[PDB]
Amino acid sequence: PRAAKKRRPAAKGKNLSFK
Amino acid sequence: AVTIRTRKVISNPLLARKQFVVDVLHPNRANVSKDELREKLAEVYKAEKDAVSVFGFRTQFGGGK
Amino acid sequence: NPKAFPLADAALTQQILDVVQQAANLRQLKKGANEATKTLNRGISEFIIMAADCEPIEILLHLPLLCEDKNVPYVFVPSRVALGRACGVSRPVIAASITTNDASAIKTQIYAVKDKIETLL
Amino acid sequence: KNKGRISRYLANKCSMASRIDNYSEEPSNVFGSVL
Amino acid sequence: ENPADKRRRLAKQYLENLKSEADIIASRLKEDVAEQQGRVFRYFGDKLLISEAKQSFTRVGENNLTCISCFQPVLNKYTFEESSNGDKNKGRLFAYTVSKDLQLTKYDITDFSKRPKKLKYAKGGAKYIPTSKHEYENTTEGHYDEILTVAASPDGKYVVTGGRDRKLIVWSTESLSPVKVIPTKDRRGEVLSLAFRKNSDQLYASCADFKIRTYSINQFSQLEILYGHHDIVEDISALAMERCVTVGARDRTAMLWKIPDETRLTFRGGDEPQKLLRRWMLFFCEGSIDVVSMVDDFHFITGSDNGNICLWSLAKKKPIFTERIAHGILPEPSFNDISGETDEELRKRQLQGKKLLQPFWITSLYAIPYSNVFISGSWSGSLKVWKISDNLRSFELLGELSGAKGVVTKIQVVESGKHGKEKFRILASIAKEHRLGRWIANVSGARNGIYSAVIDQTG
RNA sequence: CCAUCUAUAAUUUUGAAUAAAAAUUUUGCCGUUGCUAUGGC
C-alpha cells in the first residue's frame, strides 16, 4: 500500500511594517 | 521602522490555534513590547488581540533583531 | 614576434584582473604607466600588468625593459578598457603595478598569479 | 603657475614622444603631429 | 448603497465590457489573476512585428543620459480603480530620465505616434553639497554628484532617484519637488540600481557598499539591509513577489533573495572557454555580470561583459541556456593607430591577428514581466529582441532595431490598446558614455537622446 | 498630492475688419538635410 500523499503547509509567513 | 515576520507556521486544531516563530526587526530601537506585537499580529491575522499570545523574545547580540 | 609579448589567454586574464581589483581595494595597486616606472625604480613591484591594445602600443614598452632588468614578471592583457574596470578608476589604464607587501591579506592570490606569469614568460 | 603647468604638460608629451622614437624600428611622425 | 454593492456594480459593469469586447470571458477572468501565479502568461513574441516598427530618436540637451524609468497606470481588479494619481492623470504615460548633469526630467509618452514631450525638470549643482561632512547629515534637497538611477512608484505619486552622492531622494511626480531625503549612512554606499516591487510601494536599492537596502516609500523609512554579495551590486530587478534578484559584477554570482524567508539562493555561471572548445572539436570567459531582469518569478536572465546572455531557473544553480557573443565583436583597432612604425606589415603584427578582439558588453537587458520576450542593449548600434521558448529552456533572436546609436544605459517598454490588440513602445536611454563611467572609447555617431520604437501587433 | 478657482490655447456672435464678447473644450552649442531626418564638440 502507498503512503499518504504529503500535504503542503496550510499556513505561510505574513509580513507587516510600522512606525 | 519596525518589521514583524512570522515563520514555521503550524495549524494546531487540537488546541484550535496557530503556532509560529516571530522575528522582529527593530533598527535604531531597543526592542518591541509584547502588547504592541500582539496588536500588530492581531491586525495581520484578523483576530482579536485577546486571542493573540506572544512570548520567548530574545534580542540577538548586537541588537536590531 | 609581436612587440606585445607574452599576452595572456582568456582564462588567465580574469585571474589577473581578479587580483587587480582586490589590490585596488587594499591600496596595493599603482595605476598608470608613470607610477609603474617609479615602482620598478624603487624595487617595490611584485609584477606589472599592461594593455596590448594601447594606441600606440609603443608608449608602454619601456616598462618590460625595466621589468626584466629587475627580474620582475610582466604580462599584457588584451583590453585596456577592461584593465581600468578592474583597477576601479573611471578611465582606461594601460599599465598597472602590484606593490610588494608580505603582510597583505591577498598574498596567496598574488603569488598564485605570479607563478603563472613566470610560466607564461 | 600656469607657465609651469604647460612645462609639466609638455614634459609628459615629450616622454611619450621619446618612447615612440626609441623602440620603433622605423619611427614615423604621424603621432608626433597629433601629440 | 453599501460598499459591497458598489463593488458589485463595478464588477457587473466590468463584466459587461468583457461581454461587449467578446469561454473567452472565462479565460479572460483567469488572465486577470495570472499575475498572482508567478508564471509566464503573455505569449505574444511570434505576434510581434519588429520589421514594421516605427523607430525614432529624440535628442536631449543633457549630456550622457544615465537611466530611464516609465510609469504605466493599471486598472486594479480588486477595486476597479486606475492607478493614476489624479483624475487629470487618467491614462497619461510618464517617463523619467536622469543624467550625470544632475538633472531629473519627466516626459509624456501617452501619444505613441508622437515623440516624448518634456513637462518639467529639476537640476542639481554645487549648491547642494552638505556642509556638515557627516553621513547622517547628508539630507540636502538636491543632488550634488552624478545621478545614476531613477524609479517611478507604481502608484504614480512619487519618483525616486539615487546616485554616487549616497542619498535616496524621493520626488513628487507632478512638480518634481523633493519631499524626503534618505541618506544611506555609508561612506562607500553609492546607489547603483533601484527596483520597485510591482504593484507595491516597497523599494529595493543596490549600493556600492556590497549591500542591498529595502525601503517603504509610503512610509519614507528604511526597512532592512541584505548581505552576501562579494562585490558591487550593479543591477537589481523585482516582480510582484518579494523575490528580488541581483548581480555582483566581478564576483560573477547572481543572487535571489527571499525577503520573507530571510534566505538567499546563489547562482554561478561556471563556464570555461577551455571546455567550450573541445566540445566544438572565439569564446570569451565571463568577467562580470552587469545586468539582470526577471522574466518570471521562477526565471530570470543576466548579461555579462563577455557578451553572454544567460537564462536561469531557480531549480538549477547553473545556467540552463546561454547565448555567447550576443551583440557581436568590437571593431578591430586600426593598424595606423596600434603602432607608429612606417611599414604597414609591422603594424599588422601588433594587431596579433584576431586575439586582441573583445566582445560587446550587455549594457542593458530588460524582459517584459511574465512574457516570452526580452530586449538586450549595447553600444553595437542596435537593440536586439529575443523570444523565449514555450518550455522556458531556450530563446532565439526575434529581430533587431538599428535606430539606436550609442550606449543603451537602460531599456523600458510600455503597452496600450485593447487586451486583444496592443501596441508596444520601447524606450531606451542612449548616451555617449557608459553609465558607471567614461571607460569606453567614444562611439562614432553616438548621440545623447531617448530612443523610441513603436511595434504594432498583428497575426 | 487631489479637487476647485484662475492663466494659456482652440471653435463661435456683433463685426469689411481690429476689437471686445457671451458660450463651450528633436538638440547645451555648432552644421547638413526637408518643409522633416541625422553629422561634429
CATH number at residue C80: 3.30.1330.30
Q: Are E379 and E439 in contact (CB under 8 A)?
A: no
Paired with E386 in beta bridges are: E374, E397
The reply to whether C59 touches chain D by the CB within 8 Å rule is yes
Map grid coordinates 517584459 to a residue.
E368
Total domains in the fold of chain C:
1
Q: Are B22 and B34 in contact (CB under 8 A)?
A: no
The values of phi and psi at residue C16, to 5°, are -65, -50
- Cβ–Cβ gap B5/E224 under 8 Å: no
DSSP reduced 3-state for C39: helix
Q: List the grid coordinates of C14.
A: 580574469
Alpha carbon distance E438, C81 (integer Å): 10
- Cβ–Cβ gap E260/A17 under 8 Å: no
What is the CB neighbour count within 10 angstroms for residue E164? 19
CA-based nearest residue to E153, from E247, E239, E72: E72
Alpha carbon distance C108, B24 (integer Å): 41
- Cβ–Cβ gap A13/E219 under 8 Å: no
Paired with E204 in beta bridges are: E195, E214
Residue C75 burial by Cβ neighbours in a 10 Å radius (0-12, 13-18, 19+): buried
Alpha carbon distance E233, D8 (integer Å): 40
List CB-based contacts (under 7 A) with strand F.
E 56-61, 63, 85-89, 114-115, 117-118, 157, 172-175, 177, 403, 405, 442, 444-449
The H or E element that residue E276 is part of is helix E273-280
Measured CA to CA in angstroms, residue E61 lies from E103, E105, E106, E242, E443 at distances of 11, 11, 14, 37, 18
Alpha carbon distance D5, C3 (integer Å): 33
Q: Which of residues 249-288 of E touch C (CB under 8 A)?
A: 250, 272-274, 283-285, 287-288
Domain assignment of residue C48, given as a range: 1-121
Alpha carbon distance C22, C88 (integer Å): 10
Measured CA to CA in angstroms, residue E97 lies from E167, E368, E455 at distances of 17, 20, 22
Q: Are E334 and E348 in contact (CB under 8 A)?
A: no
CA-based nearest residue to E380, from E367, E362, E393: E362
Paired with E446 in beta bridges are: none
What is the CB neighbour count within 10 angstroms for residue E151? 24
What is the CB neighbour count within 10 angstroms for residue E262? 15
Closest E-chain CA to C61: E339
Strand F nucleotides within a 7 Å radius of protein CB atoms: 1-3, 26-29, 37-41
Helix-then-strand count for chain E, H and E: 5, 30
Q: Are E143 and E167 in contact (CB under 8 A)?
A: yes
CB-side exposure of E137: number of CA atoms within 13 Å?
6
CA-based nearest residue to E307, from E254, E246, E358, E367: E358
Paired with E367 in beta bridges are: E374
CA E208 to chain centre: 18
Alpha carbon distance E121, E104 (integer Å): 5
Gaps in chain B with C–N over 2.5 Å, residue before each: none
Alpha carbon distance E230, E140 (integer Å): 31
